[PDB]
CSV table of C-alpha atoms in Angstrom, one decimal:
chain,number,residue,atom,x,y,z
Y,1,UNK,CA,-134.8,106.1,-12.5
Y,2,UNK,CA,-131.7,108.4,-12.3
Y,3,UNK,CA,-130.5,111.6,-13.9
Y,4,UNK,CA,-127.2,111.8,-15.7
Y,5,UNK,CA,-125.1,114.8,-14.8
Y,6,UNK,CA,-122.0,116.0,-16.6
Y,7,UNK,CA,-118.9,116.5,-14.6
Y,8,UNK,CA,-115.6,118.4,-14.9
Y,9,UNK,CA,-112.8,116.0,-15.7
Y,10,UNK,CA,-114.6,113.9,-18.3
Y,11,UNK,CA,-116.9,112.1,-15.9
Y,12,UNK,CA,-120.6,111.4,-15.4
Y,13,UNK,CA,-122.6,110.8,-12.2
Y,14,UNK,CA,-126.1,109.4,-11.9
Y,15,UNK,CA,-128.3,111.1,-9.3
Y,16,UNK,CA,-131.6,109.6,-8.2
Y,17,UNK,CA,-134.6,111.6,-9.4
Y,18,UNK,CA,-136.1,111.8,-5.9
Y,19,UNK,CA,-134.7,111.6,-2.4
Y,20,UNK,CA,-135.0,108.8,0.2
Y,21,UNK,CA,-136.6,108.8,3.7
Y,22,UNK,CA,-133.7,110.8,5.0
Y,23,UNK,CA,-134.1,113.2,2.2
Y,24,UNK,CA,-130.8,112.2,0.7
Y,25,UNK,CA,-130.0,111.4,-3.0
Y,26,UNK,CA,-128.2,108.3,-4.2
Y,27,UNK,CA,-125.2,108.8,-6.5
Y,28,UNK,CA,-123.6,106.3,-8.9
Y,29,UNK,CA,-120.6,106.8,-11.2
Y,30,UNK,CA,-118.2,104.6,-13.2
Y,31,UNK,CA,-114.7,105.9,-13.4
Y,32,UNK,CA,-112.5,103.9,-15.8
Y,33,UNK,CA,-114.6,100.7,-15.2
Y,34,UNK,CA,-114.6,101.2,-11.4
Y,35,UNK,CA,-118.1,101.5,-9.8
Y,36,UNK,CA,-118.5,104.2,-7.2
Y,37,UNK,CA,-121.5,105.0,-5.0
Y,38,UNK,CA,-122.5,107.4,-2.4
Y,39,UNK,CA,-125.2,109.5,-0.8
Y,40,UNK,CA,-125.8,113.3,-0.9
Y,41,UNK,CA,-128.0,115.9,0.7
Y,42,UNK,CA,-128.1,117.7,-2.6
Y,43,UNK,CA,-130.0,116.8,-5.7
Y,44,UNK,CA,-127.8,118.2,-8.5
Y,45,UNK,CA,-125.1,115.5,-8.7
Y,46,UNK,CA,-122.8,117.0,-6.1
Y,47,UNK,CA,-121.5,115.0,-3.1
Y,48,UNK,CA,-119.1,112.1,-2.4
Y,49,UNK,CA,-118.9,108.7,-4.0
Y,50,UNK,CA,-116.6,105.9,-3.0
Y,51,UNK,CA,-115.3,102.6,-4.3
Y,52,UNK,CA,-112.4,100.1,-4.0
Y,53,UNK,CA,-109.9,99.1,-6.7
Y,54,UNK,CA,-109.1,95.4,-7.4
Y,55,UNK,CA,-105.9,95.9,-5.4
Y,56,UNK,CA,-108.0,97.1,-2.4
Y,57,UNK,CA,-107.0,100.8,-2.9
Y,58,UNK,CA,-109.7,103.1,-1.7
Y,59,UNK,CA,-111.2,105.6,-4.3
Y,60,UNK,CA,-113.2,108.7,-3.5
Y,61,UNK,CA,-114.9,111.1,-5.9
Y,62,UNK,CA,-115.9,114.5,-4.5
Y,63,UNK,CA,-118.0,116.8,-6.5
Y,64,UNK,CA,-118.3,120.4,-5.3
Y,65,UNK,CA,-121.7,121.8,-4.4
Y,66,UNK,CA,-122.0,123.9,-7.6
Y,67,UNK,CA,-120.6,121.1,-9.9
Y,68,UNK,CA,-117.7,123.4,-10.6
Y,69,UNK,CA,-114.9,121.1,-9.3
Y,70,UNK,CA,-114.2,117.3,-9.1
Y,71,UNK,CA,-111.6,115.6,-7.0
Y,72,UNK,CA,-110.7,112.0,-7.7
Y,73,UNK,CA,-108.5,110.5,-5.0
Y,74,UNK,CA,-106.8,107.1,-4.5
Y,75,UNK,CA,-105.7,106.0,-1.1
Y,76,UNK,CA,-103.9,103.0,0.4
Y,77,UNK,CA,-106.1,100.0,1.4
Y,78,UNK,CA,-106.8,101.4,4.9
Y,79,UNK,CA,-108.0,104.8,3.4
Y,80,UNK,CA,-105.5,106.7,5.5
Y,81,UNK,CA,-102.6,107.8,3.2
Y,82,UNK,CA,-103.1,109.4,-0.2
Y,83,UNK,CA,-101.7,107.8,-3.4
Y,84,UNK,CA,-103.0,110.1,-6.1
Y,85,UNK,CA,-105.3,113.1,-6.4
Y,86,UNK,CA,-106.8,114.5,-9.6
Y,87,UNK,CA,-108.6,117.8,-9.4
Y,88,UNK,CA,-110.3,119.6,-12.2
Y,89,UNK,CA,-111.2,123.2,-11.3
Y,90,UNK,CA,-114.1,125.2,-12.6
Y,91,UNK,CA,-111.7,126.9,-15.0
Y,92,UNK,CA,-111.2,123.3,-16.3
Y,93,UNK,CA,-107.5,123.4,-15.2
Y,94,UNK,CA,-106.4,119.9,-14.2
Y,95,UNK,CA,-104.1,119.2,-11.2
Y,96,UNK,CA,-102.6,115.7,-11.2
Y,97,UNK,CA,-100.7,114.8,-8.0
Y,98,UNK,CA,-98.8,111.7,-7.0
Y,99,UNK,CA,-97.8,111.0,-3.3
Y,100,UNK,CA,-95.0,109.1,-1.8
Y,101,UNK,CA,-95.4,106.2,0.8
Y,102,UNK,CA,-95.9,108.9,3.5
Y,103,UNK,CA,-98.6,110.7,1.5
Y,104,UNK,CA,-96.4,113.7,0.7
Y,105,UNK,CA,-96.5,115.4,-2.7
Y,106,UNK,CA,-93.8,113.9,-4.9
Y,107,UNK,CA,-95.2,114.9,-8.4
Y,108,UNK,CA,-97.7,117.4,-9.7
Y,109,UNK,CA,-98.7,117.9,-13.3
Y,110,UNK,CA,-100.8,121.0,-14.1
Y,111,UNK,CA,-102.7,120.9,-17.4
Y,112,UNK,CA,-103.8,124.4,-18.3
Y,113,UNK,CA,-107.1,125.1,-20.1
Y,114,UNK,CA,-105.3,125.5,-23.4
Y,115,UNK,CA,-103.6,122.2,-22.8
Y,116,UNK,CA,-100.1,123.5,-21.9
Y,117,UNK,CA,-98.5,121.9,-18.9
Y,118,UNK,CA,-96.3,122.5,-15.9
Y,119,UNK,CA,-94.7,119.2,-14.9
Y,120,UNK,CA,-93.1,119.1,-11.5
Y,121,UNK,CA,-91.3,115.8,-10.7
Y,122,UNK,CA,-89.0,114.5,-8.0
Y,123,UNK,CA,-90.6,116.8,-5.5
Y,124,UNK,CA,-88.9,116.8,-2.1
Y,125,UNK,CA,-90.0,117.9,1.4
Y,126,UNK,CA,-88.7,121.5,0.9
Y,127,UNK,CA,-90.9,121.7,-2.2
Y,128,UNK,CA,-87.9,121.7,-4.5
Y,129,UNK,CA,-87.7,119.6,-7.6
Y,130,UNK,CA,-87.4,119.4,-11.4
Y,131,UNK,CA,-89.7,121.4,-13.6
Y,132,UNK,CA,-90.8,121.4,-17.2
Y,133,UNK,CA,-93.2,123.6,-19.1
Y,134,UNK,CA,-94.8,121.9,-22.1
Y,135,UNK,CA,-95.9,124.6,-24.6
Y,136,UNK,CA,-97.3,124.3,-28.1
Y,137,UNK,CA,-94.4,123.2,-30.3
Y,138,UNK,CA,-91.6,123.0,-27.7
Y,139,UNK,CA,-90.7,122.4,-24.1
Y,140,UNK,CA,-88.8,124.4,-21.4
Y,141,UNK,CA,-86.8,122.8,-18.6
Y,142,UNK,CA,-85.5,123.8,-15.3
Y,143,UNK,CA,-86.0,123.5,-11.5
Y,144,UNK,CA,-88.6,124.1,-8.8
Y,145,UNK,CA,-88.1,125.7,-5.4
Y,146,UNK,CA,-90.6,126.9,-2.8
Y,147,UNK,CA,-89.9,130.4,-4.1
Y,148,UNK,CA,-90.2,129.9,-7.9
Y,149,UNK,CA,-90.0,127.8,-11.0
Y,150,UNK,CA,-87.0,128.7,-13.2
Y,151,UNK,CA,-87.0,127.5,-16.8
Y,152,UNK,CA,-83.7,128.0,-18.7
Y,153,UNK,CA,-82.7,128.3,-22.4
Y,154,UNK,CA,-79.0,128.6,-23.2
Y,155,UNK,CA,-77.6,129.8,-26.5
Y,156,UNK,CA,-73.9,130.6,-26.8
Y,157,UNK,CA,-72.9,132.7,-23.7
Y,158,UNK,CA,-76.5,133.9,-23.3
Y,159,UNK,CA,-78.8,132.3,-20.6
Y,160,UNK,CA,-82.5,133.1,-20.7
Y,161,UNK,CA,-84.4,132.4,-17.5
Y,162,UNK,CA,-88.2,132.3,-17.2
Y,163,UNK,CA,-89.3,132.6,-13.6
Y,164,UNK,CA,-92.8,131.6,-12.5
Y,165,UNK,CA,-93.3,132.7,-8.9
Y,166,UNK,CA,-95.1,130.6,-6.3
Y,167,UNK,CA,-98.0,133.0,-7.0
Y,168,UNK,CA,-97.9,132.4,-10.8
Y,169,UNK,CA,-96.2,135.7,-11.6
Y,170,UNK,CA,-93.9,135.5,-14.6
Y,171,UNK,CA,-90.6,137.4,-14.9
Y,172,UNK,CA,-87.8,136.8,-17.5
Y,173,UNK,CA,-84.2,137.7,-17.4
Y,174,UNK,CA,-81.1,137.4,-19.6
Y,175,UNK,CA,-77.4,137.1,-18.7
Y,176,UNK,CA,-74.5,137.0,-21.2
Y,177,UNK,CA,-71.0,136.2,-20.2
Y,178,UNK,CA,-69.7,137.7,-23.4
Y,179,UNK,CA,-67.6,140.8,-22.4
Y,180,UNK,CA,-67.3,142.5,-25.8
Y,181,UNK,CA,-69.4,145.6,-25.4
Y,182,UNK,CA,-70.1,145.2,-29.2
Y,183,UNK,CA,-72.1,141.9,-29.0
Y,184,UNK,CA,-73.0,141.4,-25.3
Y,185,UNK,CA,-76.8,141.0,-24.9
Y,186,UNK,CA,-78.4,142.7,-21.9
Y,187,UNK,CA,-82.1,142.9,-21.2
Y,188,UNK,CA,-84.8,144.8,-19.3
Y,189,UNK,CA,-88.1,143.1,-18.1
Y,190,UNK,CA,-91.3,145.1,-18.2
Y,191,UNK,CA,-93.6,143.3,-15.7
Y,192,UNK,CA,-96.6,145.4,-16.8
Y,193,UNK,CA,-96.6,144.1,-20.4
Y,194,UNK,CA,-94.7,140.8,-19.8
Y,195,UNK,CA,-92.0,141.9,-22.3
Y,196,UNK,CA,-88.3,141.4,-22.2
Y,197,UNK,CA,-86.4,144.0,-24.2
Y,198,UNK,CA,-83.0,142.8,-25.4
Y,199,UNK,CA,-80.3,145.4,-26.1
Y,200,UNK,CA,-76.9,145.0,-27.9
Y,201,UNK,CA,-74.4,147.8,-28.1
Y,202,UNK,CA,-76.7,150.4,-26.6
Y,203,UNK,CA,-79.5,149.6,-29.2
Y,204,UNK,CA,-82.7,147.7,-28.6
Y,205,UNK,CA,-82.8,144.7,-30.9
Y,206,UNK,CA,-86.0,142.7,-30.1
Y,207,UNK,CA,-88.9,142.4,-27.7
Y,208,UNK,CA,-89.8,138.9,-26.5
Y,209,UNK,CA,-93.4,138.9,-25.2
Y,210,UNK,CA,-94.5,136.1,-22.8
Y,211,UNK,CA,-98.2,136.2,-23.4
Y,212,UNK,CA,-101.2,135.2,-21.3
Y,213,UNK,CA,-102.0,132.5,-23.9
Y,214,UNK,CA,-98.7,130.8,-22.8
Y,215,UNK,CA,-96.8,131.6,-26.0
Y,216,UNK,CA,-93.7,133.7,-26.8
Y,217,UNK,CA,-93.5,136.2,-29.6
Y,218,UNK,CA,-90.5,137.9,-30.9
Y,219,UNK,CA,-90.5,141.3,-32.7
Y,220,UNK,CA,-87.4,143.2,-33.9
Y,221,UNK,CA,-86.6,146.9,-33.6
Y,222,UNK,CA,-85.5,148.9,-36.6
Y,223,UNK,CA,-81.7,149.5,-37.0
Y,224,UNK,CA,-82.1,152.8,-35.1
Y,225,UNK,CA,-82.9,150.7,-32.0
Y,226,UNK,CA,-85.8,153.1,-31.1
Y,227,UNK,CA,-89.0,151.7,-32.5
Y,228,UNK,CA,-90.4,148.3,-33.3
Y,229,UNK,CA,-90.8,147.3,-37.0
Y,230,UNK,CA,-92.9,144.7,-38.7
Y,231,UNK,CA,-95.1,142.6,-36.4
Y,232,UNK,CA,-94.4,140.0,-33.6
Y,233,UNK,CA,-93.8,136.4,-34.7
Y,234,UNK,CA,-95.1,133.5,-32.5
Y,235,UNK,CA,-92.4,131.1,-31.5
Y,236,UNK,CA,-93.3,127.5,-32.5
Y,237,UNK,CA,-90.1,125.6,-31.7
Y,238,UNK,CA,-87.3,125.7,-29.3
Y,239,UNK,CA,-84.8,126.6,-32.1
Y,240,UNK,CA,-86.6,129.9,-32.7
Y,241,UNK,CA,-86.2,131.0,-29.1
Y,242,UNK,CA,-82.5,130.1,-29.4
Y,243,UNK,CA,-82.3,132.1,-32.6
Y,244,UNK,CA,-83.8,135.2,-30.8
Y,245,UNK,CA,-80.9,134.9,-28.3
Y,246,UNK,CA,-78.1,134.9,-31.0
């Protein structure tokens, strides 16, 4: 009789209660109606399982020694070139990767623990491509390079650019082609608090905070332009970002 073990990525594996003559444990899993099997020198459910799709595609499930990570891979029928790879980390973040005929990354969708997503599509050999960030209530669009993701919001002559570096570091910038010194928006980015401060006509007007919970809040300054007033408001739709840029 086997032991059921819960896995990252909404999966289950059955591990034999005792080992075999080689001291190895049998593993069984069913992943979307596909039966996988394998053998492990651990007893906790970790190890490697394999199977074959109806179309002859090879399938391999790798479970990390501590049960923290699962990797679900599909290959071409000879097992040589990757087709897709789904990795759930111990922080429960999900990486969903598609590969081209040559087994090179052509698409990656990152699902964060809070369910927000970074969608990279049309990925080329220089790592460039199209990018989208799916937040709660709205979506941000831009491009990917080997250096950074850049998501853009335009409103009038103001262009707001959210940069995510290859390391995951966020920085935000604002450029206005308005040349009237009365209404032109400019902005300073405080990397330490993840806050962009917008200024018009030498007065601070609002703080946009790009939070660690993957939200944006807006808070106004008083008419003096010196101190914040009220309390920050969480953006819930793309139109409210645009309004903050007016």
